[PDB]
Amino acid sequence: MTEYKLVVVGAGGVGKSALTIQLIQNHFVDEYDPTIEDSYRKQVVIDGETCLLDILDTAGQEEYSAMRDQYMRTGEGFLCVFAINNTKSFEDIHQYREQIKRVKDSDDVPMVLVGNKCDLAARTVESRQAQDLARSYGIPYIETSAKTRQGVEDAFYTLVREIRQH
Ligand SMILES: Nc1nc2c(ncn2[C@@H]2O[C@H](COP(=O)(O)OP(=O)(O)NP(=O)(O)O)[C@@H](O)[C@H]2O)c(=O)[nH]1
Ligand SMILES: [Ca+2]
Ligand SMILES: [Ca+2]
Ligand SMILES: [Mg+2]
Ligand SMILES: [Mg+2]
Known part of the structure; x- marks a missing residue:
């Protein structure tokens, strides 16, 4: 089957792990344990x-x-x-x-x-500011909450759909 290699990057504490764990394991990690480098795999x-x-x-x-x-x-x-x-x-x-x-x-x-x-x-970053940055890169902007699950699947699935346009 088709394998997609996704990498989640960004500054410390922004919620990379919480996002990935919400997607893969369906719960919210409340505590903050800084990551070195972890891998997750799931068939979807x-x-x-x-x-x-x-x-x-x-x-x-x-x-x-x-x-x-x-x-x-x-x-x-x-x-x-x-x-x-x-x-x-x-x-x-x-x-x-x-x-x-x-x-x-x-x-x-x-x-x-x-x-x-x-x-x-x-909030100190307004949606429009982020939309403009994404536009300059030629990519989508999506807002998420790892806490509520808002947008979480959309973010990762959108990345899959972008890989498929390349
Ligand atoms: N309210 C709220 N808190 C969040 C959200 N995502 C992450 N957090 C919180 O922010 C903290 C850092 O989350 P974490 O996922 O560990 O961040 P990270 O980007 O993986 N950190 P690192 O780069 O050090 O590995 C945790 O306390 C976590 O609960 C979110 O969507 N909403
Ligand atoms: Ca929890
Ligand atoms: Ca680009
Ligand atoms: Mg992390
Ligand atoms: Mg401002």
């Missing part, structure tokens, strides 16, 4: 196609920035996550995109921009 049906999602959950802590080149090499599509209550995590997106762009030597890498924690009211 997306638009009538049975496929395997291989998801790499990466480190947001800058300490582990050295490991980025390896995972950017292998991944087929990237979920670029920031938190809507964390302006710095939004500003950090470009450095993730730029590295992906260098490594793939492509301006057309399948990606989705994800604004997570949309359940929180302390």
Whole structure:
């Protein structure tokens, strides 16, 4: 069956792990345990196609920035996550995109921009700002909450549908 290699990237604490765990295991991780690098696999049906999602959950802590080149090499599509209550995590997106762009030597890498924690009211990144960033990359913007599950499947499935346009 078709295998899709997804990689979830973004600053520390934006909810990369919570998003992936919500998708794969259907519960919300409330505590914060910083990730080094974890892998998840699950067979799903997306638009009538049975496929395997291989998801790499990466480190947001800058300490582990050295490991980025390896995972950017292998991944087929990237979920670029920031938190809507964390302006710095939004500003950090470009450095993730730029590295992906260098490594793939492509301006057309399948990606989705994800604004997570949309359940929180302390918003400092407005949807329109994020829409504009995504537009400049030629990719979709989707808001999510790993807490409520809002948008979680849409984000990952959209990344699959982007990989399929490439
Ligand atoms: N309210 C709310 N909290 C969230 C959401 N997603 C993650 N969190 C919380 O934010 C904290 C960090 O989540 P986590 O998934 O560990 O972040 P991360 O991006 O994987 N961190 P790291 O890069 O260090 O591995 C946790 O307390 C988690 O419960 C969300 O959508 N809503
Ligand atoms: Ca929990
Ligand atoms: Ca692009
Ligand atoms: Mg994590
Ligand atoms: Mg503002």
